[model samples]
Target: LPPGWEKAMSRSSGRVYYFNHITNASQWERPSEPARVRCSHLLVKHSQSRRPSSWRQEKITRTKEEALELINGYIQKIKSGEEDFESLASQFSDCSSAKARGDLGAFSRGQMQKPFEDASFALRTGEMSGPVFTDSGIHIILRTE
Candidate 1:
């Protein structure tokens, strides 16, 4: 409501506030990208709980070290032409999209959680990423297109 001030959400932090000026507002906005990206990820959650109450009894199939090792194994297989990314994702991922081979579908910037979005943009087509952690789980990602 103040003169020369505007409200905007930060692309990196998702925090909303009034910027002192239009220029400041522009700085916080999401930059345009040429196209959306499509990727698949294998998520291994530390907690299997569907609700907070169930956290106490939640059991994880893979610890951080184990997930890293598993991902590395698949990476080796991929590099040697012994395996495919999608099939590996379907077999190892804990996310709901596992059935679809871990496909998160096409998305532009700001559409995904911050850490995931940053990793997604940093990857080039046909690239495979190491473990990327978020609140939900650790992700081993592959950029498809």
Candidate 2:
């Protein structure tokens, strides 16, 4: 073990991050409300990978076009300030952030990934872009300046 010569590594930890799909038909909720809610409920399934950074990326149910439509719509909602940024994003986002209430308030450019970051914060306030492509597929982005 040499001083200042230690190696830094990231382990790929694998887990099944659950995202529940629920719909409220209570008939009293507003038409503008989210169709889903956080279930904190999770299930653990075994896999061969045990690296600390590993993630079992989930596949979205909608077709590419459909998913893009949703993403675009949500971005527009955010840009128009019609929806609470975190709330709408959390309720609508497909990833784990949905659980955190989509509080991705600010992230650095080029840190998110190509195309997504490029399109997300690449413009002045009210500008829109994408169906940007990356390993995670397509995304729509709006910049608040």
Candidate 3:
């Protein structure tokens, strides 16, 4: 690697690339693919959320308690097999990705909110979560990859 270039390797493939720390350029056309995980999450936003709005409703005035209870219900339903994660996420998630089954798609470590990133990385494939709170709102995450 040359000076001002930083080295990174694919966590799964072991293929390496160099990125320039100062100029933010990379040896390749795209960023070096590191370890990544895919997830679909159902989000419920509350008034205290950083945005306090959603693609779901016009005015989201739900409190944190209200959001928690609603999100928790979805979690219980999914866990009990009464509802499917994808179904609920698509129909009810506050995020715009709700239309796409709440699929956040494959993302690297720094691509998501801190808590959501940590929770996604912590879980095994096919494992679902219960109310992983973040700046946006409460999220019930399903690890798909």
Candidate 4:
């Protein structure tokens, strides 16, 4: 809630974390370039079952299929250039990256879930892929640069 500090969430655990652009100056372990894709995503969580007290859930409102359809619609808009990735993500993503307009920054190789990594690495620059279901939820990914 402090000024200039951004909120982030763990994709694997959904735990909240904070980042201050002024404080964190460390280099990213796996960086990106033209060959290596930099990707961002919009997540529409669909976990309907309640968890035990030890766990946390988003209380997702839509069903899995419904979420997928929603993301697919967004993808269509993106493909037509009617909507950009960042704004759509900021408005609708259920993941913590929403704070950064759905930007996951950049990464390479084995840094994300198997399905996510597979789908991400498969895309060409400026391509978008979506309705990818992981253990976390549904994701619509965009290769930013």
Candidate 5:
């Protein structure tokens, strides 16, 4: 479930279906995909991050350029199959979402930083992004849904 989905058996059909309590919609199969995009992001906070503390380090002071280089390295690993996104995210992402394999869950317009939101939404399924910079730091976005 991406969030807001409830599962139960249907009275008429006796089959399980998913319902979105928030949107008042139902789906006969698995939970319906979000209207536009679903994503998980690997965020690396640099010194300039609005609040630099993260699960990875409480006192991070890396410059944005250094952060960019690390993000580039991660992109390469995923691109070359040397690493998968979830595993790397679990180990290195600075965002607490890293605990859930970096899943940002369901998101849409205006919910994220402008550049991150735009670049992430533009990716096709299974497409991982290059470095997308934001005030929070460098982000490597993966479109999971």
Candidate 6:
């Protein structure tokens, strides 16, 4: 990690991704705003499950209900404190963070999905929120203030 990139680590152990840009790639033809064209240190904490190059972007958009179910399940398991967050995220999370066991070390607000932003920001230090539905998917947020 570089000096500046260090700031993008997630304060929490979990993170999520959005598929809109991926789904609309044919029309957009380029990485969307809030997303970088290259994989730079700035993008360290963020990752997408599907790469934009495969021409499969925007191919699958999950329904709201499906998003909700995914997140709620995570919240349930995390709240129980019985499941390993990274492993659970690996099995359940659709974002690239799953590759790292959901270890988004730290991050800035705009770097994350909007629903994640709302839920993560709403949390106080050592607080958690979610099972909340957002455009990308459902989220289980743990924030460090």
Displacement of residue 10 (Cα, Å) in model 1 is 38
Per-residue error (Å), model 3, residue 9 = 42
Clashes of 2: 10
lDDT tens digits by residue: candidate 4, 1-145: 4443467776777776654333221121221324456888887776441321111233565677886788778877876789988888888887768888889988887688877777677655775674676777777877776
Comparing 3 with 6 on lDDT, the higher-scoring candidate is 3
After superposition, candidate 4 runs with Cα above 4 Å error: 1-36, 48-58
Model 5 lDDT at residue 56: 84
Off by over 4 Å in 1: 1-35, 47-58
Which prediction has more favorable lDDT, 1 or 4? 4
Global lDDT of each model?
0.65, 0.40, 0.80, 0.66, 0.80, 0.42
Clashes of each: 0, 10, 0, 0, 0, 11
Deviation in Å, model 5, residue 1 alpha carbon: 35
lDDT of 3 by residue, 63-98 (tens): 999999998788879877999999999999999999
**Cα lDDT of model 6 by residue, 16-66, tens digit:** 322222111011121222211111000111122233121222343554555
Of 1 and 2, the candidate ahead on TM-score is: 1
TM-score of each: 0.63, 0.42, 0.75, 0.65, 0.74, 0.48
Evaluated at residue 42, the lDDT of candidate 1 is 77
* 14-120 per-residue lDDT for model 5 (tens digits): 99987654333355778433356888888888999998889889998999889989988898898779999999999999999999999988777888888887776
- lDDT against true structure, model 4: 0.66
Ranked candidates, highest TM-score first:
3, 5, 4, 1, 6, 2
- Among all candidates shown, the one with the greatest TM-score: 3
TM-score pick, better of 4 and 6:
4
Q: Which pairs of residues collide in model 2?
A: 11-52, 11-53, 12-51, 12-52, 12-53, 12-54, 13-51, 13-52, 13-53, 13-54
